[PDB]
Amino acid sequence: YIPPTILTKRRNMESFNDCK
Amino acid sequence: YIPPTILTKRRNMESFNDCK
Amino acid sequence: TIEIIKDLFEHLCGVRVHRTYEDDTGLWFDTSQGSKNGIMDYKLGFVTEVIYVPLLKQRTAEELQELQKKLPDYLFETLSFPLRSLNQFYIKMSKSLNK
Amino acid sequence: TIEIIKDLFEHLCGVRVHRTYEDDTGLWFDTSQGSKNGIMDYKLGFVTEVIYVPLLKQRTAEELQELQKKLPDYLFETLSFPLRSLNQFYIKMSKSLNK
């Protein structure tokens, strides 16, 4: 098993939402 | 899509098969 | 499972894949890459033309000049480049983040 | 979906994970890493601590020779190291093969 990395939190960040 | 690379062919190699 | 694969590349490669999706323009990945010293969020697209979209709108002003101190001008601009160059791009992104 | 992840990381980082499997010892990955200059076949295992098993038996003598000039002595032996150092290993590995 692998512990979560710091970068996992950024999945829910707002900048990713736009797909235009 | 993403084309094949030299590393893909190595999956079939025999060294990976033995796990002990 | 594939969550383990994503977990492996965070620690091995310093790159986390959040999402994969395919739209009419092409195939995309929501990607974040870095450590405590520096994190960069972007979109990788594949058309084979490769499109990297840097995400700075939601970024903190305090976080940006530290990136600007560590990262080159072109890394803050949207780019297009061929597939063979992708490893070098990773070497540019990785090296700049560990300053 | 799973394949696109593996395909992206092949070009991005030069690391292809053929298979993953979980046994009594722990969770394992079958990996090959390299470019034209040098390829390295190994197994990555996690128990945290990480285990590195290099597969040199399939390799030819000529293949081993080129790798031995580029690679340090420790890299040819099975290694145990903590998870925090996992990116450090990737660095040295990718960097040595390109040498």
Author numbering:
A (entry chain C), B (entry chain D): 166 to 185
C (entry chain B), D (entry chain A): 70 to 116, 128 to 179
What does the original paper state about this entry?
In S. cerevisiae meiosis I, sister kinetochores are fused through the action of the kinetochore-binding monopolin complex, and together bind a single microtubule. The conserved core of the monopolin complex comprises two nucleolar proteins, Csm1 and Lrs4. These proteins form a distinctive V-shaped complex, with two Csm1 homodimers bridged at their coiled-coil N-termini by a pair of Lrs4 subunits, thereby positioning two pairs of Csm1 globular-domain “heads” ~ 10 nm apart at the apices of the V. Each Csm1 globular domain has a conserved hydrophobic cavity implicated in binding the kinetochore protein Dsn1, leading to the proposal that monopolin could bridge Dsn1 molecules from sister kinetochores to physically fuse the kinetochores. A ~ 40-residue region within the disordered N-terminus of the core kinetochore protein, Dsn1, has been identified as the kinetochore receptor for the monopolin subunit Csm1.
Mam1, which is found only in point-centromere fungi, binds Csm1 and Hrr25 independently, through two flexibly linked domains, thereby acting as a molecular tether to recruit Hrr25 to the monopolin complex. We also determined a 3.0 Å-resolution structure of Cg Csm169–181 in complex with the Csm1-binding region of Cg Mam1 (residues 162–216). In the crystal structure of Sc Csm1:Mam1, Mam1 forms an extended interface with Csm1 that includes an α-helix binding to the “side” of Csm1 and a phenylalanine residue (Sc Mam1 F262) inserted into the conserved hydrophobic cavity of Csm1. As these data are difficult to reconcile with our finding that Dsn1 Box 2-3 interacts with the same surfaces on Csm1, we determined a new crystal structure of a Cg Csm169–181:Mam1162–216 complex. This structure closely resembles our earlier structure of the S. cerevisiae complex, but does not include an ordered α-helix or any interaction with the Csm1 hydrophobic cavity. Closer inspection of sequence conservation in Mam1 orthologs reveals very poor conservation beyond the “core” region of Mam1 that interacts with Csm1 in our new structure, suggesting that the additional interactions observed in our earlier structure of the S. cerevisiae complex represented non-specific crystal packing interactions rather than a biologically relevant interface. Thus, our new structural data support the idea that Mam1 and Dsn1 Box 2-3 can bind simultaneously to a Csm1 protomer, rather than competing for Csm1 binding. Interestingly, our structural modelling suggests that Mam1 is positioned close to the solvent-exposed residues on the Dsn1 Box 2 α-helix, suggesting a potential further interaction that could stabilise the ternary complex and explain the role of these residues in Dsn1 Box 2.
